[PDB]
Amino acid sequence: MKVEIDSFSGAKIYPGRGTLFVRGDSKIFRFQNSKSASLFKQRKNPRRIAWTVLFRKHHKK
């Protein structure tokens, strides 16, 4: 097995934990918790949410 990355925020998802959304064009999204899951259903931008690893990468910390 292997430990994974949040499709929104970029964090290790130990299995047993999390949910997995698939879009109609078959896009596979993983979410560790309902914070990231509800924020993606609110279409929040990962480059704007200030605790995301994409925020971490876009602001170089």
Partner 1 sequence: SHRKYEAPRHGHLGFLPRKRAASIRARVKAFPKDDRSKPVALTSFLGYKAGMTTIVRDLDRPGSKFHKREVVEAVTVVDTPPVVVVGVVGYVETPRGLRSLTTVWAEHLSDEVKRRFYKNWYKSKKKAFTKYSAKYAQDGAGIERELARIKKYASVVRVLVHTQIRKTPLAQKKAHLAEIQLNGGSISEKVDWAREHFEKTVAVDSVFEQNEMIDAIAVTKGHGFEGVTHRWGTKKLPRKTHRGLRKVACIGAWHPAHVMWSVARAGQRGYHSRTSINHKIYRVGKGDDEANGATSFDRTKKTITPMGGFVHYGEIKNDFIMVKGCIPGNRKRIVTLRKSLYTNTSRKALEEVSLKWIDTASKFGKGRFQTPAEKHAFMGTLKKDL
Partner 2 sequence: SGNGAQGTKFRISLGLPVGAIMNCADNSGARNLYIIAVKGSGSRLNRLPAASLGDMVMATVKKGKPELRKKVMPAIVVRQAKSWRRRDGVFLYFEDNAGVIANPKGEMKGSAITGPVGKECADLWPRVASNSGVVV
Q: How far apart are CA 29 and CA 11, in angstroms?
A: 13
Binding status of residue 21 toward partner 2 by CB under 8 A:
yes
- Residue 5's binding partner, choosing from RNA, partner 2, partner 1, none, with beta-carbon cut-off 5 to 8 A by kind? none
DSSP state of 1: -
Selected binder of partner 1 within 11, 39, 49, 54 (CB under 8 A):
11
Q: How far is the CB of 24 from partner 1 (least distance, A)?
A: 27
Binding status of residue 28 toward partner 2 by CB under 8 A:
yes
